[PDB]
Amino acid sequence: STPLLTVRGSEGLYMVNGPPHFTESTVFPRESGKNCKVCIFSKDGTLFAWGNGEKVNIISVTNKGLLHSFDLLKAVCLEFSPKNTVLATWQPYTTGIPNLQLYDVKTGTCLKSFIQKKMQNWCPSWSEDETLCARNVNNEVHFFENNNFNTIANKLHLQKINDFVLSPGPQPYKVAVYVPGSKGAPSFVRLYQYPNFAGPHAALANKSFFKADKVTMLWNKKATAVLVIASTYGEQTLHYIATNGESAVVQLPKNGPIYDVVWNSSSTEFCAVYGFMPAKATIFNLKCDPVFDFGTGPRNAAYYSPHGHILVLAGFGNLRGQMEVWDVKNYKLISKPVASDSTYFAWCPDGEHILTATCAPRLRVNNGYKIWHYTGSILHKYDVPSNAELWQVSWQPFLDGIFPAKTIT
Numbered sequence: 001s002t003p004l005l006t007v008r009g010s011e012g013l014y015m016v017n018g019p020p021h022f023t024e025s026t027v028f029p030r031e032s033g034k035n036c037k038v039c040i041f042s043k044d045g046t047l048f049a050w051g052n053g054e055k056v057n058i059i060s061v062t063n064k065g066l067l068h069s070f071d072l073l074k075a076v077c078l079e080f081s082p083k084n085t086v087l088a089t090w091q092p093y094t095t096g097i098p099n100l101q102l103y104d105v106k107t108g109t110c111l112k113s114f115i116q117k118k119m120q121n122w123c124p125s126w127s128e129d130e131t132l133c134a135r136n137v138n139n140e141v142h143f144f145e146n147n148n149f150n151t152i153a154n155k156l157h158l159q160k161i162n163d164f165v166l167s168p169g170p171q172p173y174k175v176a177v178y179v180p181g182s183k184g185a186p187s188f189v190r191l192y193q194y195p196n197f198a199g200p201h202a203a204l205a206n207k208s209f210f211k212a213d214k215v216t217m218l219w220n221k222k223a224t225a226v227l228v229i230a231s232t233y234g235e236q237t238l239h240y241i242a243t244n245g246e247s248a249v250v251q252l253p254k255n256g257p258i259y260d261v262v263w264n265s266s267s268t269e270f271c272a273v274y275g276f277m278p279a280k281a282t283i284f285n286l287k288c289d290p291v292f293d294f295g296t297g298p299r300n301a302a303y304y305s306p307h308g309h310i311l312v313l314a315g316f317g318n319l320r321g322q323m324e325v326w327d328v329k330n331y332k333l334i335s336k337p338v339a340s341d342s343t344y345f346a347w348c349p350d351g352e353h354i355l356t357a358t359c360a361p362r363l364r365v366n367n368g369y370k371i372w373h374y375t376g377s378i379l380h381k382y383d384v385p386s387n388a389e390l391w392q393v394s395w396q397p398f399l400d401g402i403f404p405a406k407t408i409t
Contacts, residue, residue, distance in 0.1 A: 003045065003349050004061065004396040007382070008036050009359075009367070010389040013050055018396075019353050019371060022380040027061055042080035045349075045396040047105065049087055051075045058087060058105060061396065068108040073101070079123045083130045085147055086111060090122040100124075102149065112149035125166050127173045132194060134175070136164060141177065143194065154195045163215060167223035174204065174243060176217045176226045187211050189228045189241055207239045207247035221400075222267035225286060233257045233300070238272060240288050250288045254280045259300035264308040264328070265400070271302045271311060281313050283328065292331050298322050305351040307405030310334070310374050312354070316342050323354075325374045327408045334408065335376030341366050349398040351405055353379070360389040369393040 002018030004025055013033025015025035028048070039050035041061070049058045056070040056078065075089035086102045093099040098113035100122060114135065116122050125134045133144040139160035145153040159179050167174035173194045181187045191204040212230035219226055228239035236258035238250040252258065254275030263270045269291055273281045278296035285291050298315040313324040321342050325334040339345070339356035343363050346355045357369040367390040368383035384390050
């Protein structure tokens, strides 16, 4: 029942059984994976799509078998809709055929195509239940209901909207929208509940801030709050915006960059990694008060386990790859494993194992991956031969609530 790994590189695409076996998986024939430029699992990990730039294949991971071959589909990017109804595909716009193509997974027919010139945020945003699908079109948000893409159900027009995120979980869905503002005016993030956009008291919340080059909005799993990172790795501010209408600048008690901000899956805590090296890391509660301080370290990244019971404070990029593994139930350091030269980190959905990889193009030497236990043991590793590259390693995803949050003993 352990999550699979997909390994995509010059030696081709293959799958590996998860811990503790790490045997090559018969779910995926290596033969089918040459020159693989893109691959993705569905959110529930039951479907898998891959393309070589000439074609796209869809297989069932669970009910092993090819579902579709799209023999002329030159997809560069792929994403399934959250309940597996749709495979969204993107290729560069040329001339021009609509380049964003949504395929019905059951029938392999084309549900809808759109012009999507920018690769950034190319994919439509489904609600977790797929009852809602939104696109940022001409700086407005267009909403589609029930995968009916022939009629726009609702439009959100608010000056120019540059980005939006839908709240996760069940209905009613909320949306956070980022409005940069007119020249010389402050930016803001506003929260709405779909479809209540009209009237002077429609907005759940508003937080204004001085224009930034880059804004990231992060919902909590309970859809009660958004963290907003307003950024130019230097010069960021962190804003908290709650669906109850409370908003605040988060007070980070050390000058310098904000490297990372992540929610606990509990939705009542978040972690910020901040300040000129050595970076501070702090857990905050919904009052944006410090809950626990990790002091300082060689960190620029934070990763909660899916269950939110373990926190890794890691230093990747230009740092030496130290991963401080914290028990964040007991607030105890478990381990400080070192994943030198890592370009990629991901928790296993089991909340026990960790994938680190070194991939081209971010790094051209020492390509390979390691599977860790969070206690710092190396359970599995693979190094590519000198004449080979690794491009991607990823876990088979699983929906929350399938793997238990195993006690740290």
